[PDB]
Amino acid sequence: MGVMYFKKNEFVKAKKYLKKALEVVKDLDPSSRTTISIQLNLGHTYRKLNENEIAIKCFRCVLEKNDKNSEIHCSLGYLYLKTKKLQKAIDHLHKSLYLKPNNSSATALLKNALELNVTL
Amino acid sequence: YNAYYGLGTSAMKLGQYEEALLYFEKARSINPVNVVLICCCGGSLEKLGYKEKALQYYELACHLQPTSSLSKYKMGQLLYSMTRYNVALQTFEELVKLVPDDATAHYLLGQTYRIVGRKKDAIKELTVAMNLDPKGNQVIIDELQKCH
Amino acid sequence: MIRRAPTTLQLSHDDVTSLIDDLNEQKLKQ
Amino acid sequence: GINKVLDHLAPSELIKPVKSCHNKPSVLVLDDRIVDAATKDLYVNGFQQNPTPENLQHMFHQGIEILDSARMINVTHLALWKPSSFKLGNPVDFALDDNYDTFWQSDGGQPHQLDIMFSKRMDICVMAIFFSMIADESYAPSLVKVYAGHSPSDARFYKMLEVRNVNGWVALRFLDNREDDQLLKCQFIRLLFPVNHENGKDTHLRGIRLYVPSAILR
């Protein structure tokens, strides 16, 4: 329900439904590819909801539970470059390039982050 | 910082001067205490066209390391390009004091002396240059008949 | 029961292009 | 303005002086027994009994560094190569490996062809070929004709090369086609080896290179 409301460009009810999904599964089974999807979709909704702090928190949680994830590191680079945390942005972006050298957007993101850091 | 320096060099050899400068500034920021990183970044800046900022960075480098032969070589080259031979003279003098056994220093010292106009200094330094090395004597010979 | 793998949200290229552009005019502002 | 530019694109009466071309194919002399300023420009290793192969391997190197000593850009590896036929022993890699010991050998019809077709428009200026009269007399290239063109469709004759005695790198800069640019502008180059010395059959190629114009930390 959260995913379909997100796809329907109606994020507010998607956010509440994914929050309900998280709170139902919060107490049990942190592993088993369920909490991972819940937290990832919730972080995506928050980043599309323009609220970044809790999105970064959930992305950090899933990165803790799974480090082998190029998409996660690209998302952290996105969120950190949205804010002015350039060091974390470039670190996670380099991690993503390490995870997958041939990333289309990540090259441009790295160029922009380096240019902004130098000009800062 | 070694990765940053390598990226800057790789951008430099391909002609992307502004990108190479972009890497080199970060390389400096990682390790503020350096000399040849300073020199390479300043060379990138003068490739951009910012000669004054390149000179300021070069002066910061020479202040940080008073004994740096390559830095002094860069001050000499840049001052020769900018027609500041009055101070370039003492730069080459201190440089040839630092390195007495290299024919390149004698060559540039004699060339600067000839440009200034001291014929005796130019001929003496060029004679030392040919005595030290015959591999590059082709240019040294030309500097001979030009002065003579 | 064979539970289906839950669908996951992806970071689209359009939104990241929009954000990098917005950052470009942001730095161009001052 | 429309008319005047068309006249520039299509100069009708301005160009043709007399229409009196000889129409014969010009032949280039490669002999290294005569010393001349023009020959020294095209022949690099210098005029000289037959040197032993170790001198040939030796002189193979200074000819490389002398050609590489000048301000020049090598794009020999920036194009696709397709010879007439292989012999399953050595592809054209051993011809372009810049090693005298290794070489590429073709095996097939007598008019051997070597194709050098480019991906992008690159303006070649200096053509470098190494020959070994004494090391490879049996498979020495005696007769060389270089083509030019923008495609396999429009390949056309450019120059004539008769080989009598050359143990060394041969430099071939192009001035006839463009006197203003002093360089060649084509995307498609092919070479033919229709006959060898002393009525040979096959042909090697010790060296080949392509030239175009344009302290540290570990």
Curated annotation (Swiss-Prot), chain A:
Localization (cell): Nucleus
Extent of the TPR repeats: 1-27, 33-65, 70-99
Post-translational modification remark: Phosphorylated by CDC28, which is required for the early mitotic activity of the APC/C in its CDC20-bound form.
Signal peptide: none
Function, in words: Component of the anaphase promoting complex/cyclosome (APC/C), a cell cycle-regulated E3 ubiquitin-protein ligase complex that controls progression through mitosis and the G1 phase of the cell cycle. The APC/C is thought to confer substrate specificity and, in the presence of ubiquitin-conjugating E2 enzymes, it catalyzes the formation of protein-ubiquitin conjugates that are subsequently degraded by the 26S proteasome.
Other notes: Present with 2753 molecules/cell in log phase SD medium.
Family to which this protein belongs: Belongs to the APC6/CDC16 family.
Subunit relationships: The APC/C is composed of at least 13 subunits that stay tightly associated throughout the cell cycle: APC1, APC2, APC4, APC5, APC9, APC11, CDC16, CDC23, CDC26, CDC27, DOC1, MND2 and SWM1. Interacts with AMA1.
Protein name per its UniProtKB record: Anaphase-promoting complex subunit CDC16
Full protein segment contained here: 639 to 758 of 840
Curated annotation (Swiss-Prot), chain B:
Modifications after synthesis and translation: Phosphorylated by CDC28, which is required for the early mitotic activity of the APC/C in its CDC20-bound form.
Further remark: Present with 593 molecules/cell in log phase SD medium.
Sequence ranges of the TPR repeats: 1-34, 35-68, 69-102, 103-136
Designated gene of the protein: CDC27
Subcellular location: Cytoplasm; Nucleus
Protein name: Anaphase-promoting complex subunit CDC27
Bilayer-spanning residue ranges: none
Function: Component of the anaphase promoting complex/cyclosome (APC/C), a cell cycle-regulated E3 ubiquitin-protein ligase complex that controls progression through mitosis and the G1 phase of the cell cycle. The APC/C is thought to confer substrate specificity and, in the presence of ubiquitin-conjugating E2 enzymes, it catalyzes the formation of protein-ubiquitin conjugates that are subsequently degraded by the 26S proteasome.
Swiss-Prot record, chain C:
Localization per Swiss-Prot or TrEMBL: Nucleus
Modified residues (Phosphoserine): S12
Highest taxon of source: Eukaryota
Assembly and binders: The APC/C is composed of at least 13 subunits that stay tightly associated throughout the cell cycle: APC1, APC2, APC4, APC5, APC9, APC11, CDC16, CDC23, CDC26, CDC27, DOC1, MND2 and SWM1. CDC26 is required to tether the essential subunits APC9, CDC27 and CDC16 to the complex.
Purpose: Component of the anaphase promoting complex/cyclosome (APC/C), a cell cycle-regulated E3 ubiquitin-protein ligase complex that controls progression through mitosis and the G1 phase of the cell cycle. The APC/C is thought to confer substrate specificity and, in the presence of ubiquitin-conjugating E2 enzymes, it catalyzes the formation of protein-ubiquitin conjugates that are subsequently degraded by the 26S proteasome.
Family: Belongs to the CDC26 family.
Name assigned to this protein: Anaphase-promoting complex subunit CDC26
UniProt organism field: Saccharomyces cerevisiae (strain ATCC 204508 / S288c)
Region of the whole protein represented: 1 to 30 of 124
From Swiss-Prot, chain D:
Primary localization: cytoplasm
UniProt subcellular location: Cytoplasm; Nucleus
GO MF terms, alphabetically ordered: enzyme regulator activity
Residue ranges of domain DOC in the record: 51-214
Alphabetically ordered keywords of this record: Cell cycle, Cell division, Cytoplasm, Mitosis, Nucleus, Ubl conjugation pathway
Substitution effect: S85F: In DOC1-1; G2/M cell cycle arrest at 37 degrees Celsius
Gene Ontology CC: anaphase-promoting complex; mitochondrion
GO terms (BP aspect): anaphase-promoting complex-dependent catabolic process; cell division; chromatin organization; protein K11-linked ubiquitination; protein ubiquitination; regulation of meiotic cell cycle; regulation of mitotic cell cycle
A UniProt-annotated Pfam family: ANAPC10
Pathway given in the UniProt record: Protein modification; protein ubiquitination
InterPro entries the record matches: APC10/Doc1 (IPR016901), APC_su10/DOC_dom (IPR004939), Galactose-bd-like_sf (IPR008979)
Remarks, miscellaneous: Present with 1364 molecules/cell in log phase SD medium.
Family, as annotated: Belongs to the APC10 family.
Function, in words: Component of the anaphase promoting complex/cyclosome (APC/C), a cell cycle-regulated E3 ubiquitin-protein ligase complex that controls progression through mitosis and the G1 phase of the cell cycle. The APC/C is thought to confer substrate specificity and, in the presence of ubiquitin-conjugating E2 enzymes, it catalyzes the formation of protein-ubiquitin conjugates that are subsequently degraded by the 26S proteasome.
Record's protein name: Anaphase-promoting complex subunit DOC1
Protein source organism: Saccharomyces cerevisiae (strain ATCC 204508 / S288c)
Lineage: Eukaryota, Fungi, Dikarya, Ascomycota, Saccharomycotina
Gene from which this protein is expressed: DOC1
